[PDB]
Design an enzyme around this catalytic site. Structure first.
Site, PDB file in Angstrom:
ATOM      1  N   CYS A  62       0.851  -1.185   0.000  1.00  0.00           N
ATOM      2  CA  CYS A  62       0.000   0.000   0.000  1.00  0.00           C
ATOM      3  C   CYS A  62       0.888   1.237   0.000  1.00  0.00           C
ATOM      4  CB  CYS A  62      -0.935  -0.010   1.200  1.00  0.00           C
ATOM      5  SG  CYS A  62      -2.243   1.228   1.124  1.00  0.00           S
ATOM      6  N   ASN A 214     -30.096  -1.714   1.584  1.00  0.00           N
ATOM      7  CA  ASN A 214     -31.069  -1.102   0.682  1.00  0.00           C
ATOM      8  C   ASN A 214     -31.405  -1.985  -0.515  1.00  0.00           C
ATOM      9  N   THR A 215     -30.789  -1.696  -1.662  1.00  0.00           N
ATOM     10  CA  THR A 215     -31.157  -2.342  -2.918  1.00  0.00           C
ATOM     11  C   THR A 215     -30.970  -3.852  -2.834  1.00  0.00           C
ATOM     12  N   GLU A 284     -23.289   1.234  -2.306  1.00  0.00           N
ATOM     13  CA  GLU A 284     -23.609  -0.171  -2.105  1.00  0.00           C
ATOM     14  C   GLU A 284     -22.393  -1.069  -2.296  1.00  0.00           C
ATOM     15  OE1 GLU A 284     -26.684  -0.146  -0.598  1.00  0.00           O
ATOM     16  OE2 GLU A 284     -25.900   1.835  -1.122  1.00  0.00           O
TER      17      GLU A 284
END
Ligand SMILES: [Zn+2]
Ligand SMILES: [Zn+2]
Ligand SMILES: [Zn+2]
Ligand SMILES: [Zn+2]
Ligand SMILES: [Zn+2]
Ligand SMILES: [Zn+2]
Ligand SMILES: [Zn+2]
Lengths: 313, 68, 573, 303
Positions: A62, A214-215, A284
């Site tokens: 990283c 949610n979705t 999401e």
């Protein structure tokens, strides 16, 4: 833009800290944990904590955390000569590289013999309170290294590693899940050796475990799937879960994505990111690529605390 | 966070917290403008009341009478 | 009357739960990979039967909680890890005496119970915030409840009553229900600041419920009133797993820890700070604490994760209160002997009494001596007078003799050296350094080249420590300045020099000046008289203002404002 | 001599009281899990200043540290730990660290002499004693463990040697407590070995078999040998003369006082180290002094 993987317009509508701001509660909890771990006075010095962060971030390559961390290590009274390599480091962290190996690549080989050799009498010895901070630091930095590549965030090393060709093995003495759990056993031990660290870890773990999805075509089933699958990747097997739902509740694209992120985070690409679930919104895909660090940290902490508990029994 | 100077008399390092008296006068800095030797106000006041030489050993100048 | 010694049998696998039958002859011990039964004999318990005898290690045997029954010795019941409330009836002689198998729960069950009055009604509690009730008439179910909380633990059931029923949760509340009214919890009260790991009633006192938790507390509650009234509270070492009440007494418990601690403690609810009893025969955490008695005072069973099972006796318990230190005393600076001892050592055994029972020559002589500045005779005579005025006579005689010896057909020159050295050793040995150091300083080179350096450094350091102990800084620094050894005339030369700056240019000034090289403004001006300060300079740290040492003191006595003028109280009054 | 009773306002047995460096403050502890600090006033009165809770077990020995490092305390309790409490400016005491290494309860904790830096020693019931060090003086949170010794027996008391000279290497005394009928010694002497940088075995008091309950070294102030005290069922005073591996010692016995007809619990010396004090189960305090010919005798009985 902060990231070349997420569109700048999406980020504006909704240097890597601003990315995590779309989640308020977890941003707050992570910032609290980071502030206590790396800035507040404690058993170790600030320079040593920054060096530990450096060595725990120079494991997934990283080139974002091996940066600022060495850029703020120098401004805290650190020795500029130490960055030449671990060969130049004092013979006090040399005992930490062997355990830094598996805490980032292959967690399952930890046992009593490793911690004992670390807590061995001589001219350079650790105490419990000053190695439990070190291992929490290492796990936190590994989790951040995984997440940063999990969002592909846009802003020498090989002279800091021992045997840098180790990698992660697929997997196949498994770890039974509800035999040594955090909410019952590990929390007491971490709290006893480290009171504030235990509470902050606790708040982080429940804050991450209260986020919605949610979705969905009941935003709990996919959560449990993505939570237990990464665990059984590491070796902890929950007997209660029916594992048909694991394959029947997550697209193979999702599975390959999460494995690529959590195993070899340098391997992710923009095509790899977009190839799964194009019909969604990026938060999401963030709330999923952002719980994997939490599951990884949970598994690592559980394994480490099982290793340390046997040393006193 | 590196050590601050200390009194030549108390040998204790100086410092002041930066109704209840938070930081009395006796704990303030005070130094000779020719020596740069310093200490607490109270201890220097007591020392120069009965003596007249620079409090530190091997120092020479007569600190108080320079200005009085 | 039960008659057993202290014996510990062996198990091949670790266990997690014990239950005791009404006959006090056999005990159930079970865990994840053991389901045997053991029978209690007069001398040694021996293996009797193995209930776990299935051909394959199936998952509906790894029990976590086992309960027997008090009126039907053939009935048994347990909770399997993944929800299986499997009941066992030994009446069927078909080897594996199983019975009605239950699988109608969602996640890990935690504890099972029984009604101490009926043999058909069964309870259960699991991680779902649920409470599975059943009827052993093989029915369908009974009254499955909605806890609206987190994982349920330590369900249990009332003792004297028939319909009351409580259950403690994981976020920290305890409830109370009724079988006939399964819609709403009758009582609501928070108990702990963490997971409530334990619960048990009081066999004697009705309504006196006692709960334990991860808070490392144990609290007994009064349910006689309409509210949750506390009566006591016990602080412990670690998390409390099981809370058990001893029979035939009214104020003793028995609690086992969950991590680190491997020890059982028998707390007295009246005395909550020091345990009454203590057992220390184990190697890992003790998972279960169970009685052996319908009602007897001094027999306790146990079971741990080291694969052990043992019976206890009140008499053999390692009593710690009888073997503790009851006193403590220390000396003060001048004399302040402070003594503390039990109320049973000075005259009702859990209290102490504090009293203070209660060197001027040292302090008086410190500042009244003379060490330099005058010839030998003047110093010797003055010191002799100072000694005589106090009462010590031999020291005055020593002063006068030294003056005769030094300040004098003649005696040899180095004739008195041994005598002087032996005097210094004699005075230093008995613990009086105020004389050896002073004589050393005054005589100087006449005697300093006779003693070794280490002993001199010892004298000086010890005397300076004693002087600083009394806050006599003037004389301590005086000894430092005139000290005849190099290692002592260096204490005030270490980190005592400041570095001075100009507040207009922010650059350093030299060590022997009062003006600025770039600024040219004389940066040493008292804020009271506007004159150049060449000597001592006080400095407030919050204002960066200051001036003459004497001026600032008078101003600060007069008022509480920075004389230079800036809203700032340099001392905060 | 007169006494002034002070309202403890504690809920259990007081274990220790310790005095400040300058003699104006004193600290108390108890098995009620608390520590209180009292300061003297202008009219010689004592009143409380701080009543905060410290541990979760019975709080044993509490000590003061030299004010060159600040107003920093220490404590041990039934919790197998040890704290380095400090007072900061109204004022209140705030924790700085918590040394958690022993598997059994820590019995005694004693600060080292000034001339060897800031150190702290703790003895554990299982028989392990350990020395700590804080090289960064201004932050009392970077504590390190330097040495670890095994005593092969239970540990009950610890006492440092205050000899400030550079001809005496640092040494530490260990007081055992085991009562098992197997004879064997209790008190042992450990001496620093700067040649090898480790603590060695210097001497062992063979004439001590009854349980030892408190130990103490006499302040030196200039003495060329070492004086020891032991709180057994009797009161004993020992003398140790170093002859010019560890140094070889000569162990003599000076006092065999047995007029307490009880079990002696505590021992305490003076500042000049010429008078001793002790308390036993009988309930009073005795004072012992030397009659200038190595012949000690009682000089008071306070009750
Ligand atoms: Zn000077
Ligand atoms: Zn001063
Ligand atoms: Zn001067
Ligand atoms: Zn200027
Ligand atoms: Zn002026
Ligand atoms: Zn001002
Ligand atoms: Zn000011």
């Amino acid at each position: 833009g902060p990231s070349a993987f997420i569109p700048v317009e999406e980020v504006l509508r909704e240097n890597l800290a601003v990315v995590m701001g779309l989640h308020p509660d977890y941003f707050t909890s992570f910032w609290r944990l980071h502030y206590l771990l790396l800035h507040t006075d404690g058993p170790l010095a600030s320079s040593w904590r920054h060096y530990i962060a450096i060595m725990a971030a120079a494991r997934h390559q990283c080139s974002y955390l091996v940066g600022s961390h060495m850029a703020e290590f120098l401004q805290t009274g650190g020795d500029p000569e130490w960055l030449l390599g671990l060969h130049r480091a004092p013979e006090k962290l040399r005992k930490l590289s062997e355990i830094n190996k598996l805490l980032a690549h292959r967690p399952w080989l930890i046992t009593k013999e490793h911690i004992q050799a670390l807590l061995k009498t001589g001219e350079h010895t650790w105490s419990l309170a000053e190695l439990i901070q070190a291992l929490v630091l290492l796990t936190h930095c590994h989790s951040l290294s995984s997440f940063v590549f999990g969002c592909g965030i846009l802003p020498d090393m090989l002279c800091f590693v021992e045997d840098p060709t180790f990698g992660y093995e697929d997997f196949t003495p498994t770890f039974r899940a509800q035999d040594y759990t955090w909410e019952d056993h590990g929390y007491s031990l971490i709290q006893r050796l480290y009171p504030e660290g235990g509470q902050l870890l606790d708040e982080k773990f429940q804050a991450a475990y209260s986020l919605t999805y949610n979705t969905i075509a009941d935003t709990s089933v996919l959560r449990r799937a993505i939570w237990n699958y990464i665990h059984c990747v590491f070796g902890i097997r929950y007997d209660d879960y029916d594992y048909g739902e694991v394959n029947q509740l997550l697209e193979r694209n999702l599975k390959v994505y999460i494995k690529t992120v959590a195993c070899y985070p340098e391997k992710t690409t923009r095509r790899m990111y977009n190839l799964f679930w194009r019909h969604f919104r990026h938060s999401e895909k963030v709330h999923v690529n952002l719980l994997l660090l939490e599951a990884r940290m949970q598994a690592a902490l559980l394994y480490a605390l099982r290793a340390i508990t046997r040393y006193m029994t | 966070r590196k050590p601050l100077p200390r009194c030549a008399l108390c040998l204790i390092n100086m410092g002041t917290p930066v109704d209840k008296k938070l930081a009395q006068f006796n704990n303030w800095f005070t130094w000779c403008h020719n020596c740069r030797h310093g200490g607490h106000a109270g201890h220097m006041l007591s020392w120069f009341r009965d003596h007249a030489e620079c409090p530190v050993s091997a120092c020479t100048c007569k600190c108080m009478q320079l200005d009085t | 009357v039960l008659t057993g010694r202290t014996m510990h049998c062996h198990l091949d696998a670790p266990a997690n739960a014990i239950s005791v039958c009404r006959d006090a002859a056999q005990v159930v011990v079970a865990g994840r990979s053991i389901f045997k039964i053991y029978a209690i004999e007069e001398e040694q318990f021996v293996e009797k039967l193995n209930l776990r005898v299935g051909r394959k290690p199936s998952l509906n045997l790894s029990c976590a909680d086992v309960v027997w029954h008090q009126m039907d010795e053939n009935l048994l019941a347990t909770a399997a890890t993944n929800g299986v409330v499997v009941t066992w009836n030994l009446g069927r002689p078909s080897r594996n005496k199983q019975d009605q198998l239950f699988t109608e729960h969602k996640r890990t069950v935690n504890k099972v119970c029984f009604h101490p009055t009926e043999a058909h009604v069964l309870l259960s509690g699991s991680q779902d915030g649920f409470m599975k009730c059943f009827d052993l008439r093989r029915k369908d179910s009974v009254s499955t409840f909605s806890g609206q909380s987190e994982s349920v633990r330590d369900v249990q059931f009332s003792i004297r009553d028939y319909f009351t029923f409580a259950s403690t949760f994981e976020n920290g509340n305890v409830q109370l229900w009724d079988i006939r009214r399964p819609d709403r919890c009758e009582r609501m009260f928070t108990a702990h600041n963490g997971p409530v790991f334990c619960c048990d009633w009081h066999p004697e006192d009705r309504g006196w419920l006692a709960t334990g938790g991860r808070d490392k507390m144990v609290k007994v509650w009064d349910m006689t009133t309409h509210r949750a009234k506390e009566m006591h509270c016990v602080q412990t070492i670690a998390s409390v797993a099981r809370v058990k009440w001893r029979p035939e007494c009214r104020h003793h418990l028995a609690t086992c820890s969950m991590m680190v601690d491997h020890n059982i403690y028998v707390w007295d609810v009246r005395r909550p700070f020091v345990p009454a009893a203590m057992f220390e025969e184990h190697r890992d955490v003790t998972t279960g604490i169970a009685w052996r008695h319908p009602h007897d005072p001094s027999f306790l069973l146990s079971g741990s994760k080291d694969s052990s099972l043992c019976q206890h006796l009140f008499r053999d318990a390692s009593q710690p209160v009888e073997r503790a230190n009851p006193e403590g005393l220390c000396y003060g600076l001048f004399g302040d002997l402070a003594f503390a001892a039990k109320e049973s050592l000075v005259a009702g055994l859990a209290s102490s009494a504090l009293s203070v029972f209660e060197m001027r020559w040292f302090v008086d002589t410190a500042e009244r001596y003379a060490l330099a500045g005058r010839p030998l005779a003047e110093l010797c005579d003055h010191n002799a007078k100072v000694a005589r005025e106090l009462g010590r006579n031999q020291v005055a005689q020593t002063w006068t003799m030294l003056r005769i010896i030094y300040c004098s057909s003649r005696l040899p020159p180095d004739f008195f050296g041994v005598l002087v050295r032996d005097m210094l050793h004699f005075y230093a040995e008995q613990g009086d350094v105020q004389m050896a150091v002073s004589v050393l300083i005054v005589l100087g080179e006449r005697v300093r080249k006779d003693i070794d350096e280490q002993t001199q450094e010892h004298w000086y350091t010890s005397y300076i420590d004693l002087l600083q102990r009394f806050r006599l800084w003037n004389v301590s620094n005086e000894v430092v300045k005139l000290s005849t050894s190099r290692a002592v005339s260096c204490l005030n030369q270490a980190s005592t020099t400041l570095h001075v700056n100009c507040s207009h240019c922010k650059r350093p000034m030299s060590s022997r000046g009062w003006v600025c090289d770039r600024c040219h403004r004389c940066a040493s001006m008292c804020a009271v008289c506007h004159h150049v300060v060449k000597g001592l300079f006080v400095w407030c740290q919050g204002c960066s203002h200051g001036g003459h040492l004497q001026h600032i003191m008078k101003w600060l006595e007069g008022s509480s404002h920075c004389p230079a003028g800036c809203g700032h109280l340099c001392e905060y009054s | 001599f007169v006494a002034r009773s002070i309202a403890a306002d504690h809920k259990d047995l007081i274990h220790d009281v310790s005095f400040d460096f300058h003699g104006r403050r004193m600290a108390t502890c108890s098995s009620d899990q608390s520590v209180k600090v009292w300061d003297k006033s202008e009219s010689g009165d004592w009143h409380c200043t701080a009543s905060w809770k410290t541990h979760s077990g019975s709080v044993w020995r509490v000590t003061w540290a030299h004010p060159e490092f600040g107003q920093v305390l220490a404590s041990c309790s039934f919790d197998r730990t040890a704290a380095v409490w400090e007072e900061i400016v109204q004022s209140h005491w705030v924790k700085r660290t918590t040394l958690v290494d022993s598997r059994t309860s820590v019995t005694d904790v004693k600060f080292a002499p000034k001339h060897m830096g800031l150190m702290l020693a703790t003895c554990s019931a299982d028989g392990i004693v350990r020395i700590y060090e804080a090289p960064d003086v201004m932050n009392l949170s970077q504590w390190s463990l330097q040495h670890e010794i095994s005593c092969k027996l239970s540990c009950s008391c610890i006492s440092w040697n205050p000899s400030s000279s550079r001809a005496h290497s640092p040494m530490i005394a260990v007081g055992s407590d085991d009562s098992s009928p197997n004879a064997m010694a209790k008190v042992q002497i450990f001496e620093y070995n700067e040649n090898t940088r480790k603590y060695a075995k210097a001497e062992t008091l063979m004439t001590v078999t009854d349980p030892v309950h408190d130990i103490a070294f006499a302040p030196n102030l200039g003495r060329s040998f070492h004086i020891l005290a032991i709180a057994t069922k009797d009161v004993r005073i020992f003398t140790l003369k170093p002859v010019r591996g560890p140094t070889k010692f000569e162990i003599h016995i000076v006092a065999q006082f047995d007029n307490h007809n009880s079990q002696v619990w505590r021992v305490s010396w003076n500042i000049t180290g010429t008078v001793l004090a002790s308390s036993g189960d009988d309930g009073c305090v005795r004072l012992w002094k030397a009659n200038y010919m190595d012949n000690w005798k009682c000089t008071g009985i306070l009750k």
